[PDB]
Amino acid sequence: SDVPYYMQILDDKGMSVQTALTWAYLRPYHGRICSGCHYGSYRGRAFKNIHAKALYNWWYDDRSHYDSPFAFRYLKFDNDGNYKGVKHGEDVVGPSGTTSQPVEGLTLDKQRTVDFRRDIQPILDAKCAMCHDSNNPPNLGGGLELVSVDGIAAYSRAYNSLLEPQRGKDPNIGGKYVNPSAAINSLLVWRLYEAELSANAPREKIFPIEGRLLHNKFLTQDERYAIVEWIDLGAQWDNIPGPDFYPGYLV
Amino acid sequence: GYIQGTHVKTDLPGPFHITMSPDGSTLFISNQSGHSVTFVDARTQKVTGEVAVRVQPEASAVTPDGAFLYVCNAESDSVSVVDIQRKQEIKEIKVGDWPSGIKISPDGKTAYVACSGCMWNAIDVIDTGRMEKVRSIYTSDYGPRMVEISPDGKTLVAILDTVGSINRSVDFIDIASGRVVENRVIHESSNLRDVVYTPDGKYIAVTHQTPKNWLPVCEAENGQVFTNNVTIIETKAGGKVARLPLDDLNNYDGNPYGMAMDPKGKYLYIGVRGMHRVTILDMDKVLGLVRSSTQEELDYLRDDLGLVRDYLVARVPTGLGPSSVCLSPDGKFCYAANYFSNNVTVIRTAVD
Numbered sequence A: 001s002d003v004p005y006y007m008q009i010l011d012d013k014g015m016s017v018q019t020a021l022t023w024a025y026l027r028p029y030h031g032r033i034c035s036g037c038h039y040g041s042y043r044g045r046a047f048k049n050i051h052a053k054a055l056y057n058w059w060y061d062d063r064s065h066y067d068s069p070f071a072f073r074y075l076k077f078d079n080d081g082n083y084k085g086v087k088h089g090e091d092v093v094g095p096s097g098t099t100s101q102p103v104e105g106l107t108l109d110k111q112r113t114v115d116f117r118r119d120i121q122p123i124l125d126a127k128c129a130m131c132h133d134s135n136n137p138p139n140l141g142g143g144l145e146l147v148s149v150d151g152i153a154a155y156s157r158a159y160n161s162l163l164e165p166q167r168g169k170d171p172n173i174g175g176k177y178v179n180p181s182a183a184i185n186s187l188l189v190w191r192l193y194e195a196e197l198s199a200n201a202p203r204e205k206i207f208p209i210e211g212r213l214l215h216n217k218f219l220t221q222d223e224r225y226a227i228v229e230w231i232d233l234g235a236q237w238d239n240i241p242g243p244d245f246y247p248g249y250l251v
Numbered sequence B: 001g002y003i004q005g006t007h008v009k010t011d012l013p014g015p016f017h018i019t020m021s022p023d024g025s026t027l028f029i030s031n032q033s034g035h036s037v038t039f040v041d042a043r044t045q046k047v048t049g050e051v052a053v054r055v056q057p058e059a060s061a062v063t064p065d066g067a068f069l070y071v072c073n074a075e076s077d078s079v080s081v082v083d084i085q086r087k088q089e090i091k092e093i094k095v096g097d098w099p100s101g102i103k104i105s106p107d108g109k110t111a112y113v114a115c116s117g118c119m120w121n122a123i124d125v126i127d128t129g130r131m132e133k134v135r136s137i138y139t140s141d142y143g144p145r146m147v148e149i150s151p152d153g154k155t156l157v158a159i160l161d162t163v164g165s166i167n168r169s170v171d172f173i174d175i176a177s178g179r180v181v182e183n184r185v186i187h188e189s190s191n192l193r194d195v196v197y198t199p200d201g202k203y204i205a206v207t208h209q210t211p212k213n214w215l216p217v218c219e220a221e222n223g224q225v226f227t228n229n230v231t232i233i234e235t236k237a238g239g240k241v242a243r244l245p246l247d248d249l250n251n252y253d254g255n256p257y258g259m260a261m262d263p264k265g266k267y268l269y270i271g272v273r274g275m276h277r278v279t280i281l282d283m284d285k286v287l288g289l290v291r292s293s294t295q296e297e298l299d300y301l302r303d304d305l306g307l308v309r310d311y312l313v314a315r316v317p318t319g320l321g322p323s324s325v326c327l328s329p330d331g332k333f334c335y336a337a338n339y340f341s342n343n344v345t346v347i348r349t350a351v352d
């Protein structure tokens, strides 16, 4: 509470179908209800009468403030890569008995994010850069070495490649390989899962009929979903606030 | 001297071509109206002599050691051999019609001469030891303008500029074999003035124009009649042929002619004869565009009149009629030969 946040509804592969773009905040001990996902219950429409299963998971105990579960750190998937469930992290916790559920995700120090330099780039170096060089776009090689563009060196070759715009496409939607805050709309993810994930096609020619190579088995589930999370988060580069030890802009 | 195709005399040299010694100390200018070749010292930028050759030289090539200069005399239908140190022509070898260009093999043992006569298809080979014309390699069509030899020296490309043809092509020759392996057509092209190789030998650049012949002649806007283009061809088997624009919407490069390739393949230099300027392009952005685009997308991008600004480094003011350009071996200087102004423009490149 007392921190800015928003939400994303997810499908059975763990990808965001719709993102709520705004900043929501809860006061301490407060709780907030909404009929739907931008349904208009908080804008122009009356609350729809709905008998929900979640209502009984909220507060059922008189010795507690709230009996609702805290946000889980990780996910569990099956062998198919489909959603199995939710998974507890290391941050679990005076404390008193004022809630039934385990206390998770209240430590700001330990809150997890996906950083391109720390997380994604090593995966790219290990499983990708071998077959992707200047002669085979996108160019994922070069490691974390910064690339100067118009007199400014910020990011690496792989980041510059993956975030590249596409002709005839609104960059607010996405680029060639990446759609920020939609992984399901991203060509990169389309190829990593080797399937058509959404009803919005990134381009006209997606899967080559000649010389095609299946990319779905190159990564484990953790790596691939790390990329998914990275894209859904807005596909940043430096996700650690303030100057850090990881490669970046310096003068 | 005489103005080309005329009996009218002029005192002006009229430089048609330029090249440089592999050690970069000397420039050799072929004077079309002067019937001679001007020697210039690179460091002092001073004329160190003028060597008389046969009628109307349009081209010259230097031996790897730099002891000899092979000049193409177009009207004389011949090739002069010049001693560089003696500043004297020691022989005249006779070739097919209008040699428009000549180049020496990497080993320096062979010279290749493109015979550009409109009804002539030939590339004449010349042994440097015999100083004589061995045989002729017949191209796929008429009018080879210029040749170029690959860095590995096992392949020879020839631009065929063929009169009365909308589709003008490029021939690939196997030097050891001495025959045509493949012919690649540049669709809707005319006036191919040059061909160059990339240092890695994976691409060739060809300057030309795109006419719209099947359309009424009505306006000058949006390149309704002529557009000016540079084409990058991938030397691999089944490689892409990418026709790319040289023009802005309201600014066009008239009649692109001469080309100079950066030694490391960083930049491309294009003499623009009609617009009297040197167009410098970024070759990694160009080749980057070629690698990342399909054939369809490139074919659509040929008519994009805003596309140049992506890969365009500069357009540099020159004298009148810069028909030819050349580079120093370090690539820090570009020289452009100006016919009407009778001079050479010296340009400091982006390389540092």
Ligand code: HEC
Residues within 6 Å of the ligand: A124, A127, A128, A129, A130, A131, A132, A137, A138, A177, A187, A188, A191, A206, A207, A208, A211, A212, A213, A214, A215, A218, A219
């Ligand atoms: C060699 C075995 C490769 C490895 C390792 C990786 N990729 Fe690849 N990729 C390879 C080829 C031969 C091709 C050609 C086109 C095709 O679909 O087969 C590709 C293509 C891609 C693409 C599509 C590019 C486009 O259509 O514009 C993407 C997005 C891509 N590759 C990404 C990618 C990633 C993320 C990799 C690490 C898991 C990776 N590639 C490895 C060959 C090889």
Ligand code: HEC
Residues within 6 Å of the ligand: A007, A008, A009, A018, A019, A020, A021, A022, A024, A032, A033, A034, A035, A036, A037, A038, A042, A043
């Ligand atoms: C699906 C994702 C959800 C859910 C679960 C909630 N909201 Fe709402 N929300 C959503 C969208 C797509 C948008 C607009 C995004 C955009 O315009 O780019 C919003 C917006 C808001 C706002 C801003 C004002 C407005 O647009 O009306 C507020 C405030 C807001 N949402 C509040 C809110 C509340 C109280 C919810 C109940 C838990 C809630 N959101 C859930 C989509 C989604």
Ligand SMILES: [Ca+2]
Residues within 6 Å of the ligand: A238, A239, A240, A241, A242, A243, A244
């Ligand atoms: Ca930081």
Ligand SMILES: [Ca+2]
Residues within 6 Å of the ligand: B074, B075, B077, B096, B097, B098, B117
């Ligand atoms: Ca003749």
Ligand SMILES: [Cl-]
Residues within 6 Å of the ligand: A034, A035, A036, A037, A038, A039, A040, A041, A042
């Ligand atoms: Cl709602």
Ligand SMILES: [Mg+2]
Residues within 6 Å of the ligand: B218, B219, B220
């Ligand atoms: Mg008009």
